[PDB]
Amino acid sequence: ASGADTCCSNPACQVQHSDLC
């Protein structure tokens, strides 16, 4: 996953991308 900043900052997305982000 590239060009992802808002997601990483978000918790809901964080848990989903814990290894990716």
Q: What is the DSSP letter of 3?
A: S
Gap between the Cα atoms of 19 and 9, Å rounded: 14
Question: How many CA atoms, within 13 angstroms, populate the side-chain half-sphere of residue 14?
Answer: 4
Which experimental technique did the depositors report for determining this structure?
A: NMR
Phi and psi, residue 8, nearest 5°: -55, -35
10-18 contact pairs (CB < 8 A, 24+): none
Gap between the Cα atoms of 15 and 9, Å rounded: 11
Judge contact between 18 and 12, C-beta under 8 A. no
Quote the distance between the C-alpha of residue 1 and its chain's center. Answer: 9
Judge contact between 13 and 7, C-beta under 8 A. yes
